[PDB]
């Protein structure tokens, strides 16, 4: 079998791997031969009909995508399955010709088992490019967390906030979906806890900036205490987002690219 990385990859392939698992291991107990050649004229039609969709949408997803590791990885996988829609529609001519073929009804126990892997591989490719888009977003927030350091003005503050808040919303949104997709409880807890700690320091960051941006309008003011505070918050929020970023990297790390 293989390694199902998400709950949705598992959900799709799992059954048809639990299928070929029993539909394999039970064949020592004596399961006798039989067949249904006509109902194989169709199943291989839509099995070559959807192996035609995955390929199709897999072509818009290969051309419309800017990811480079995507193109250097996905189109190839169009091949893995291509032979599965071939060594099975082939098993079609080994269970039609000789309806007692011990090799034939075993070329479906491999052809299809190869139809999967082309799909298990197709999905990891795509899911891994998703994780890249998430990491890029978090790197975006890390950098913008940095300009907070250069906000001296009330309308600097208003611009900063106007811009930041929507990156936070985009990051939490993605960190939320992605976690709601992970199979290990420990990675999930990490993503969620860190994302929660950064949502909680956000308002604390902006607060201290406002006391900086306005206590800088009442001479003889306790300014430095506001900067110092500002800085700690960014140091904490940055540690956090880097924690997140790393756990995503650990989970989705490249094989045919660096």
């Amino acid at each position: 079998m293989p390694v199902f990385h998400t709950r949705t990859i598992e959900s799709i392939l799992e059954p048809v791997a639990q299928q070929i698992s029993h539909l394999v291991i039970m064949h020592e107990e004596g399961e006798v031969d039989g067949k249904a050649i006509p109902d194989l004229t169709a199943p291989v039609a839509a099995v070559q009909a959807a192996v035609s969709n995955l390929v199709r949408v897999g072509k818009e997803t290969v051309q419309t995508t800017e990811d480079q590791i995507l193109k250097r990885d996905m189109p190839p996988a169009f091949i893995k399955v291509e032979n599965a829609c071939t060594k099975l529609v082939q098993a079609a001519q080994m269970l039609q010709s000789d309806p007692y073929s011990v090799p034939a009804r075993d070329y479906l126990i491999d052809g299809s088992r190869g139809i999967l892997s082309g799909t298990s591989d197709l999905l990891l490719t795509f899911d891994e490019a998703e994780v890249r888009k998430i990491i890029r977003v978090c790197k975006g927030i890390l950098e913008y967390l940095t300009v907070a350091e250069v906000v001296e003005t009330m309308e600097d503050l208003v611009t900063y906030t106007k811009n930041l808040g929507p990156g936070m919303t985009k990051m939490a949104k993605m960190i939320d979906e992605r976690q709601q997709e992970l199979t290990h409880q420990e990675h999930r807890v990490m993503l969620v806890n860190s994302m929660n700690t950064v949502k909680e320091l956000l308002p604390v960051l902006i607060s201290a900036m406002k006391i900086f941006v306005t206590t800088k309008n009442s001479k003889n003011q306790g300014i430095e205490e506001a900067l110092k505070n500002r800085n700690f918050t960014v140091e904490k929020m940055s540690a956090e987002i880097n924690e997140i970023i790393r756990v995503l990297q650990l989970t989705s790390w490249d094989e045919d690219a660096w």
């Binding site: 399961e31 039989g34 192996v51 969709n53 099975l88 299809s112 999967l116």
Partner: peptide
């Protein structure tokens, strides 16, 4: 709708390939 498109177009492939491994419980 589009980001799934690949998932749903490949959940199909898996199920029609499940109907095929069907006939082997004879």
């Amino acid at each position: 709708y589009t980001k799934k498109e690949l998932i749903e177009s490949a959940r199909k492939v898996s199920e029609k390939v499940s109907h095929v491994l069907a006939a082997l419980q004879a």
